[PDB]
Amino acid sequence: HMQIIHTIRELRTWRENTGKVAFVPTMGNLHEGHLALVREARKRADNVVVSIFVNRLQFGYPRTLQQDADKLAAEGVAVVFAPDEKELYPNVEQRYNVEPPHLQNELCGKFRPGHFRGVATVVSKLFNIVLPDVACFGKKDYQQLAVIKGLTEDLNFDIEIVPVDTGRAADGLALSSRNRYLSVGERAEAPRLYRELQAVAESLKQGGLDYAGLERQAADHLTAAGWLVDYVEIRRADTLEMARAGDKKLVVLAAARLGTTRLIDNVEVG
Amino acid sequence: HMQIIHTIRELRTWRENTGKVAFVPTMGNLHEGHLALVREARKRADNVVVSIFVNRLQFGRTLQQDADKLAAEGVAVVFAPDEKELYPNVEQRYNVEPPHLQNELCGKFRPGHFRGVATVVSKLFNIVLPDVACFGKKDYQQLAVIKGLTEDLNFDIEIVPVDTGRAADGLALSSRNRYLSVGERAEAPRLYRELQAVAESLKQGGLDYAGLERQAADHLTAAGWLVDYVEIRRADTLEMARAGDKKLVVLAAARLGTTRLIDNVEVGLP
Numbered sequence: 001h002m003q004i005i006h007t008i009r010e011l012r013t014w015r016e017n018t019g020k021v022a023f024v025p026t027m028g029n030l031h032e033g034h035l036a037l038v039r040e041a042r043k044r045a046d047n048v049v050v051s052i053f054v055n056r057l058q059f060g061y062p063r064t065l066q067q068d069a070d071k072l073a074a075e076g077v078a079v080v081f082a083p084d085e086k087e088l089y090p091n092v093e094q095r096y097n098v099e100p101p102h103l104q105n106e107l108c109g110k111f112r113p114g115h116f117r118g119v120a121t122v123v124s125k126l127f128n129i130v131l132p133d134v135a136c137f138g139k140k141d142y143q144q145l146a147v148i149k150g151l152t153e154d155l156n157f158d159i160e161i162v163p164v165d166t167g168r169a170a171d172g173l174a175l176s177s178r179n180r181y182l183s184v185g186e187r188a189e190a191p192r193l194y195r196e197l198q199a200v201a202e203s204l205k206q207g208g209l210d211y212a213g214l215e216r217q218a219a220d221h222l223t224a225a226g227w228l229v230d231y232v233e234i235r236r237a238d239t240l241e242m243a244r245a246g247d248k249k250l251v252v253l254a255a256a257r258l259g260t261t262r263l264i265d266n267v268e269v270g
Numbered sequence: 271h272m273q274i275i276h277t278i279r280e281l282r283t284w285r286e287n288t289g290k291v292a293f294v295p296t297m298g299n300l301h302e303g304h305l306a307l308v309r310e311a312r313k314r315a316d317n318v319v320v321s322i323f324v325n326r327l328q329f330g331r332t333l334q335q336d337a338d339k340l341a342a343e344g345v346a347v348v349f350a351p352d353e354k355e356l357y358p359n360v361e362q363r364y365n366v367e368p369p370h371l372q373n374e375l376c377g378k379f380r381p382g383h384f385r386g387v388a389t390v391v392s393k394l395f396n397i398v399l400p401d402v403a404c405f406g407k408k409d410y411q412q413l414a415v416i417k418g419l420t421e422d423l424n425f426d427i428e429i430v431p432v433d434t435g436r437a438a439d440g441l442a443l444s445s446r447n448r449y450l451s452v453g454e455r456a457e458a459p460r461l462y463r464e465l466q467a468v469a470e471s472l473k474q475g476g477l478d479y480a481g482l483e484r485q486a487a488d489h490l491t492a493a494g495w496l497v498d499y500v501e502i503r504r505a506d507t508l509e510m511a512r513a514g515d516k517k518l519v520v521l522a523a524a525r526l527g528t529t530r531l532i533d534n535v536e537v538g539l540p
């Protein structure tokens with residue numbers, strides 16, 4: 001049933017003659033958050049391609065290839081595309097890169113320079129390899145989602161980009177591999193991130209207009225509780241353009257560290 | 271027979287049922303040099319698309335007269351979108367960023383041009399989804415930029431270079447030629463003549479590359495030209511040339527009055 005394909009030539013050979021394709025790009029180490037992407041994908045096309053590739057160009061990491069394909073076989077995945085580095089980067093350098101706008105240096109990008117350029121570039125390469133009709137990305141990595149929506153529009157990729165809802169724990173914590181780094185005490189404290197975002201969201205829903213004050217209060221509550229806050233920001237939904245007074249479709253985003261571990265989350269408000 | 275299509279949506283609808291597509295992107299004002307491209311494309315696919323498009327992101331005759339020259343050549347589609355069709359927000363947020371080549375040779379005198387070319391060609395590639403794309407060797411640096419992005423971004427497109435069509439006096443055909451004065455047009459073939467003389471020195475074992483570049487520039491300057499550059503580079507990649515090299519290209523750009531002219535000669539040493 002399911003095929004494991006490692007070369008661009010074999011992937012293209014398989015994809016021709018096939019109809020609609022839904023595509024889920026990942027870096028492996030698959031968990032429940034990823035399966036949400038896969039399940040939504042399978043609701044949109046009979047042929048689901050999942051890519052597993054770790055990208056030297058977006059790092060600042062485990063493999064477990066055998067376990068990954070087993071989790072996906074159960075979910076009706078047609079093809080797992082897992083090329084090696086040289087397959088995608090046959091020369092050392094990547095000479096032609098997809099260059100994001102200034103968004104790449106904001107929010108998470110301020111402490112991950114080059115990261116979103118690397119994401120945009122490898123996703124463009126993957127789009128040109130798989131030629132998908134639909135591609136699923138999770139709302140938890142909102143800035144990544146905006147960059148991928150932006151490159152899709154600006155480069156005329158004929159691909160429907162499908163945001164997939166953030167899976168959360170029972171206590172509200174957004175599911176992420178990063179959670180495994182948290183000590184027992186930190187994991188009990190970790191749900192405060194989502195709680196503060198929701199409180200910002202309620203203030204906005206209740207006519208609150210002081211964006212900067214709301215961000216600071218959320219940051220102050222996190223800091224006082226032991227977090228090291230990277231940012232809390234209110235921006236326009238989908239595009240992450242600056243939030244303007246009177247905007248009705250907004251998103252609150254935050255990134256903050258408990259010890260050595262950085263957590264991110266966000267809440268959309270309408 | 272031949273269609274003029276102005277929207278991305280109608281181009282995609284026409285292309286969906288068609289098999290192999292060969293693509294010739296242009297800025298219009300067509301002349302016999304462009305027809306050379308069209309003839310090569312027509313040798314490689316039953317369906318030839320010619321695009322006519324200009325924009326303030328890469329500039330760094332009427333459409334009907336252009337379409338008449340192409341109907342005679344077996345062109346299936348003339349794709350002529352307006353600026354807003356391809357750049358609906360005016361600003362291009364996500365650009366295909368070339369390496370340092372984009373600032374060498376002509377890019378030294380055309381800031382932003384090769385970024386804009388690389389970007390608009392990627393967009394047209396994602397719109398037309400061609401199997402074959404033809405480009406002229408007269409714009410040698412452009413050809414290398416397009417081969418580089420095709421490889422680095424895994425566009426599944428065969429890039430076919432086409433030899434420079436010339437006037438009887440050797441002058442490389444170009445839309446810019448119509449702006450030349452009477453005297454300037456009579457002087458313009460000296461550019462190609464000096465490039466051939468440089469190529470002749472190289473075929474005869476000449477190793478003083480820097481001296482050859484200077485002599486041609488000085489002679490063109492002495493003849494009334496304003497020389498941007500004369501350079502000996504490695505063929506195809508345009509890497510800097512080294513003394514033993516056997517596959518070389520001599521490139522020049524120079525101005526007669528208001529009109530900037532470029533040309534090149536490839537050399538293959540035994």
Ligand SMILES: Nc1ncnc2c1ncn2[C@@H]1O[C@H](COP(=O)(O)OP(=O)(O)NP(=O)(O)O)[C@@H](O)[C@H]1O
Nearest residue numbers: 027028033137138140165166167174175176177178
């Ligand atoms: N809680 C979540 N809900 C839905 N999708 C998620 C969630 N967490 C992560 N993702 C998806 O994870 C993809 C990124 O791949 P990958 O980095 O392999 O997973 P990850 O958990 O986000 N890594 P990280 O969170 O940075 O440790 C994104 O495109 C999202 O679609």
Ligand SMILES: Nc1ncnc2c1ncn2[C@@H]1O[C@H](COP(=O)(O)OP(=O)(O)NP(=O)(O)O)[C@@H](O)[C@H]1O
Nearest residue numbers: 296297303405406409433434435442443444445446
């Ligand atoms: N004389 C020529 N011989 C072969 N190909 C050519 C020639 N002139 C242009 N082309 C190619 O035609 C395509 C479209 O080039 P384009 O810029 O539209 O024409 P152009 O003559 O260079 N106009 P301009 O540079 O503004 O004077 C490119 O792939 C060029 O390399």
